[PDB]
Write a protein that holds these residues in place. Structure first.
Motif, PDB file in Angstrom:
ATOM      1  N   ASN A  19      70.303  54.240   6.841  1.00  0.00           N
ATOM      2  CA  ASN A  19      69.407  53.092   6.805  1.00  0.00           C
ATOM      3  C   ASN A  19      69.914  51.984   7.717  1.00  0.00           C
ATOM      4  N   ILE A  20      68.983  51.286   8.367  1.00  0.00           N
ATOM      5  CA  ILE A  20      69.283  50.077   9.121  1.00  0.00           C
ATOM      6  C   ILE A  20      68.255  49.025   8.736  1.00  0.00           C
ATOM      7  N   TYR A  21      68.735  47.897   8.225  1.00  0.00           N
ATOM      8  CA  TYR A  21      67.899  46.846   7.670  1.00  0.00           C
ATOM      9  C   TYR A  21      67.753  45.723   8.687  1.00  0.00           C
ATOM     10  N   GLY A  22      66.543  45.175   8.789  1.00  0.00           N
ATOM     11  CA  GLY A  22      66.285  44.100   9.722  1.00  0.00           C
ATOM     12  C   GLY A  22      66.629  42.733   9.158  1.00  0.00           C
ATOM     13  N   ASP A  23      66.523  41.726  10.024  1.00  0.00           N
ATOM     14  CA  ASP A  23      66.846  40.358   9.640  1.00  0.00           C
ATOM     15  C   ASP A  23      65.758  39.699   8.805  1.00  0.00           C
ATOM     16  N   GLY A  24      64.533  40.220   8.841  1.00  0.00           N
ATOM     17  CA  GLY A  24      63.417  39.607   8.154  1.00  0.00           C
ATOM     18  C   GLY A  24      62.666  38.575   8.963  1.00  0.00           C
ATOM     19  N   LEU A  25      63.231  38.112  10.074  1.00  0.00           N
ATOM     20  CA  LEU A  25      62.548  37.159  10.933  1.00  0.00           C
ATOM     21  C   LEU A  25      61.424  37.844  11.706  1.00  0.00           C
ATOM     22  N   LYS A  26      60.472  37.039  12.170  1.00  0.00           N
ATOM     23  CA  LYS A  26      59.387  37.572  12.979  1.00  0.00           C
ATOM     24  C   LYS A  26      59.903  37.968  14.359  1.00  0.00           C
ATOM     25  N   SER A  27      59.247  38.957  14.959  1.00  0.00           N
ATOM     26  CA  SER A  27      59.649  39.497  16.247  1.00  0.00           C
ATOM     27  C   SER A  27      58.606  39.177  17.309  1.00  0.00           C
ATOM     28  N   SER A  28      59.065  39.103  18.558  1.00  0.00           N
ATOM     29  CA  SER A  28      58.193  38.879  19.701  1.00  0.00           C
ATOM     30  C   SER A  28      58.668  39.752  20.853  1.00  0.00           C
ATOM     31  N   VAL A  29      57.755  40.546  21.410  1.00  0.00           N
ATOM     32  CA  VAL A  29      58.086  41.468  22.492  1.00  0.00           C
ATOM     33  C   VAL A  29      57.857  40.776  23.831  1.00  0.00           C
ATOM     34  N   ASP A  30      57.646  39.459  23.793  1.00  0.00           N
ATOM     35  CA  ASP A  30      57.227  38.716  24.977  1.00  0.00           C
ATOM     36  C   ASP A  30      58.369  38.409  25.941  1.00  0.00           C
ATOM     37  N   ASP A  31      59.625  38.489  25.494  1.00  0.00           N
ATOM     38  CA  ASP A  31      60.801  38.262  26.339  1.00  0.00           C
ATOM     39  C   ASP A  31      60.772  36.858  26.954  1.00  0.00           C
ATOM     40  N   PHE A  32      60.955  35.874  26.072  1.00  0.00           N
ATOM     41  CA  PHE A  32      61.007  34.456  26.421  1.00  0.00           C
ATOM     42  C   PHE A  32      61.807  34.164  27.687  1.00  0.00           C
ATOM     43  N   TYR A  33      62.946  34.843  27.860  1.00  0.00           N
ATOM     44  CA  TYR A  33      63.863  34.497  28.944  1.00  0.00           C
ATOM     45  C   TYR A  33      63.230  34.704  30.314  1.00  0.00           C
ATOM     46  N   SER A  34      62.483  35.795  30.487  1.00  0.00           N
ATOM     47  CA  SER A  34      61.964  36.140  31.805  1.00  0.00           C
ATOM     48  C   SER A  34      60.913  35.160  32.310  1.00  0.00           C
ATOM     49  N   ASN A  35      60.274  34.395  31.426  1.00  0.00           N
ATOM     50  CA  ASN A  35      59.192  33.499  31.813  1.00  0.00           C
ATOM     51  C   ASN A  35      59.567  32.025  31.748  1.00  0.00           C
TER      52      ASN A  35
END
Ligand code: MG
Lengths: 145, 105, 99, 117, 92, 48, 100, 144
Positions: A19-35
């Motif tokens: 098992n691998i458990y996530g942080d529970g925070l929302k995710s974004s595939v938008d890649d803030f850094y590149s833009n």
């Protein structure tokens, strides 16, 4: 779990599932850094002290609010937030770190330390626990007779 | 834009006398003003660059002013010093001029 | 061990790319500044030369790597409290004279 | 040393066009602003425009906007002014100059081109 | 109270009050400590501060004497003397 | 560190405080007062 | 991790620290603002040009510091996250062996 | 504690023995000293690198130079291939450990791996000098 690692072998049979458990925070595939454009202006020009202007004496001398003139619509309808936790199921032939970590746990009252991960996960007992304590296993072997 | 008012329009001078040519700027231009001499049938010649700076072998009797008030001194007017004297500004892009006529009495 | 490994990664993998991007930037900035100063009308060539030399950027203007700051990142308060609560001192006798 | 040589057509009809040239030598053609000055016979100077040949930066006065067109060729050290829609008011002597310390000033002079419309 | 509030007194008015200070240099050697002592050689405590209502008053406290050197709890009685320097040169 | 030399004071626990005297005498006290303030010359330095 | 060899220590020494993680390349180059100089300074005098070039110089240095901080945040988010994952997993391994 | 001003007569020269002047491509070496740099007040100090310790001979050797919040170590071989390491301290800070305070500087030079600069006993920066050839230092060390 956020995802589950299924460790297979050559014949494609599940040796173990970790098992691998996530942080529970929302995710974004938008890649803030590149833009992100670093600002040239307006930020060009932070002490560990923020509450210096809070004066406890004068605050303690302010009388309590007694005659309240209420504002009628001061609140909203409380909307609870719901979350469906998704689980991924990913297969692999090369063991992951979580695989080796899970291999070090056994619910067996009588177990044996082994330094062979494949033998531990493919055990036919299954009373073998993966361990890297080389000196401990060596001493336990030396007194086996 | 910048306007250069130059005075007098015409002047008569005895050889060997001091003279002043007034150049007035409508806006402050620091020292970005330059004095030129133009003779008959000839192109103008740079006299003193900036408010007060010597150029090559120009007679050593020129250069004065700053801001909006400038003056071209001439210590000893000689016979060849006849001609039109102009001042120009190099601060704003308009690049204006003026005009005065130095004659000799 | 793993904190030092991560900092070594920053020094060996991230900082070089930051350096390359920075010299790519400063070359453009230097070219623009030199051309602008040569474009200036109300100064001579000596002033142009000294002003260009005044406002040039070299590789030293952006070499911000400070390994000690990187190490001190993990020197949090909580780490200090743990260090002082887990040091080997089991008995430290002190004695003095109060009035 | 620095020298500037102008040619011009020097004779034109009203309504036609003309292109005056100015060859520069003795200095780096792309490090000094080059400006043009119009002088009617007997009158005073009249600023026309300036070109920076380093990257072709034009700046004109409002009076000579559509009349004069300033260009410069980097490879030939030549600055050109084109006068179009010629009228009787354009008959003057035209100078192409550049300074030697303050790029805005006129220090070294060309021989001039006298045009007649 | 173990916390003895410090005060600035007229020089001819000190009398028999606690004034003898023992200085300490802890590592440069910027860290300075000041252990106060009465006229009988007894310890009054190191000179730091303590909270009284809003104001953190300068205090000789023997609680500092009970703390091991270099411990975080000793950073309250650690001091830095700043003289006017021509390298800093702001207006005094 | 020298005798007979005036020294402004810094406390290492709260560097942003300076020693001030509320009142002179046995009935007075000295306390840490903040903030220190900032001295600056633009684009050159900005320090406490 | 790097367990394919007979000795993990020598393999780490040979392959560097970066070999400990799986997502080696994650860095995104930040976009710049194209550098421009204001056009009103062409005709400025000497003294009144220098001290505003000073302001622009300090601006550029601050911009450099900002870019460095962008890279630092990228390092902490993308790279050190995996290493803290490794820290926690290794600590859990220690605890499991201690329990055994 | 030695004070050096911006005057030609405020200088210290060390004439080194002929057997201890640096001329090699492989010999590692180090330096250490305590320096107190006053705060910079004028904008003329901005982008003004000035050497304080000089051991250069025909553009080969080593020098310690200073700039606005910069302590710079410069190595240069006989082929004019040079490498610089820097320690940068900012003047935009509440309280600084370096401005007008005594700083223990240490520079180590491994001819095979790196040149490292340490401040107050802590590693600060490093640059690879393995690409440097033969370095011929000066017969004298100049403090000015
Ligand atoms: Mg307290």
């Amino acid at each position: 779990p956020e995802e589950i690692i299924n460790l297979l072998n050559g014949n494609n049979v599940s040796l173990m599932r970790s098992n691998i458990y996530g942080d529970g925070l929302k995710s974004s595939v938008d890649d803030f850094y590149s833009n992100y454009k670093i600002p040239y202006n307006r930020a060009y020009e932070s002490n560990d002290s923020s509450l210096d202007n809070v004066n406890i004496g004068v605050i303690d001398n302010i009388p309590e609010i007694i005659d309240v003139n209420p504002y009628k619509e001061n609140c909203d309808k409380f909307s609870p937030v719901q979350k469906i936790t998704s689980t991924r199921e990913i297969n692999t032939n090369i063991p992951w770190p979580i695989n080796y970590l899970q291999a070090q746990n056994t619910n067996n009252e009588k177990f044996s330390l082994s330094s062979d991960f494949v033998e531990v996960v493919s055990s036919k007992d299954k009373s073998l626990v993966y361990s890297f304590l080389s000196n401990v296993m060596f001493y336990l072997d030396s007194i086996k007779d | 834009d910048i306007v250069l008012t130059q005075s007098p329009a015409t002047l008569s001078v005895t050889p060997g006398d001091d003279v002043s040519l007034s150049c007035r700027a409508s806006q402050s231009i620091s020292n970005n003003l330059h004095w030129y001499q133009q003779k008959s049938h000839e192109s103008p010649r740079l006299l003193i660059k900036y408010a007060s700076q010597s150029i090559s072998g120009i007679p050593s009797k020129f250069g004065r002013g700053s801001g909006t008030d400038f003056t071209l001194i001439i210590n000893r007017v000689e016979t060849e010093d006849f001609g039109v004297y102009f001042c120009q500004q190099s601060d704003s892009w308009p690049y204006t001029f003026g005009g005065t006529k130095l004659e000799i009495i | 061990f793993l904190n030092n490994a991560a900092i070594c990664v920053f020094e060996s993998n991230i900082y070089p790319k930051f350096i390359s991007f920075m010299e790519q930037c400063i070359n453009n900035i230097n070219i623009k500044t030199k051309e602008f100063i040569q474009k200036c009308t109300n100064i001579n060539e000596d002033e142009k030369l000294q002003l260009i030399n005044q406002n040039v950027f070299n590789s030293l203007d952006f070499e911000f790597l400070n390994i000690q700051n990187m190490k001190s990142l993990f020197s949090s308060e909580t780490a200090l409290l743990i260090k002082e609560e887990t040091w080997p001192y089991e008995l430290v006798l002190y004695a003095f004279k109060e009035p | 040393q620095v020298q500037l040589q102008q040619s011009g057509a020097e004779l034109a009809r009203p309504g036609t066009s003309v292109k005056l040239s100015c060859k520069a030598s003795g200095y780096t053609f792309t490090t000094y602003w080059i400006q043009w000055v119009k002088q009617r016979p007997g009158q005073g100077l009249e600023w026309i425009g300036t070109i920076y040949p380093g990257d072709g930066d034009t700046r004109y006065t409002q009076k000579f906007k559509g009349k004069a067109t300033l260009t410069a060729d980097k490879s030939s050290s030549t600055a050109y002014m084109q006068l179009i829609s010629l009228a009787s008011e354009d008959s003057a002597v035209y100078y192409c100059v550049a300074g030697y310390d303050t790029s805005g000033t006129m220090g070294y002079w060309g021989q001039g081109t006298s045009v007649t419309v | 109270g173990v916390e003895k509030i410090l005060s600035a007194l007229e020089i001819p008015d000190v009398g028999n009050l606690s004034q003898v200070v023992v200085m300490k240099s802890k590592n440069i050697t910027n860290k300075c400590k000041m252990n106060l002592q009465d006229n009988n050689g007894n310890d009054i405590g190191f000179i730091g501060f303590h909270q009284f209502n809003n104001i953190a008053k300068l205090v000789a406290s023997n609680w500092y004497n009970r703390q091991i050197e270099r411990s975080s709890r000793t950073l309250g009685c650690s001091w830095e003397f700043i003289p006017v320097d021509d390298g800093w040169g702001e207006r005094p | 560190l020298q005798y007979d030399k005036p020294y402004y004071m810094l406390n290492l626990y709260d560097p942003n405080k300076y020693v001030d005297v509320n009142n002179v005498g046995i009935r007075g006290y000295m306390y840490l007062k903040g903030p220190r303030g900032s001295v600056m010359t633009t684009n050159i330095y900005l320090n406490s | 991790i790097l367990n394919t060899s007979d000795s993990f220590v020598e393999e780490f020494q040979n392959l560097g620290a970066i070999s400990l993680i799986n997502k080696k390349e994650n860095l995104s180059m930040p976009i710049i603002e194209s550098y421009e100089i204001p056009n009103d300074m062409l005709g400025l005098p000497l003294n009144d040009l220098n001290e505003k070039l000073f302001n622009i110089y300090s601006k550029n240095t601050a911009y450099f510091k900002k870019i460095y901080y962008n890279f630092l945040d990228q390092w902490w988010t993308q790279y050190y996250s995996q290493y803290f994952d490794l820290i926690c997993m290794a600590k859990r391994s220690v605890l499991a062996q201690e329990t055994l | 504690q030695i004070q050096l001003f911006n005057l030609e007569s405020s200088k210290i020269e060390v004439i080194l023995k002929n057997a201890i002047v640096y001329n090699s491509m492989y010999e590692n070496f180090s330096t250490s000293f305590w320096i107190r740099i006053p705060k910079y007040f004028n904008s003329i100090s901005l982008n003004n690198e000035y050497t304080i310790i000089n051991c250069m001979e025909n553009n080969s050797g080593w020098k310690v130079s200073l700039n606005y919040g910069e302590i710079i170590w410069t190595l240069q071989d006989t082929q004019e291939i040079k490498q610089r390491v820097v320690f940068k301290y900012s003047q935009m800070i509440n309280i600084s450990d370096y401005i007008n305070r005594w700083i223990f500087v240490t520079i180590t030079n491994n001819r095979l791996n790196n040149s490292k600069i340490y401040i107050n006993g802590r590693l600060i920066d490093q640059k690879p000098i393995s690409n440097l050839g033969n370095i011929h230092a000066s017969n004298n060390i100049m403090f000015k």
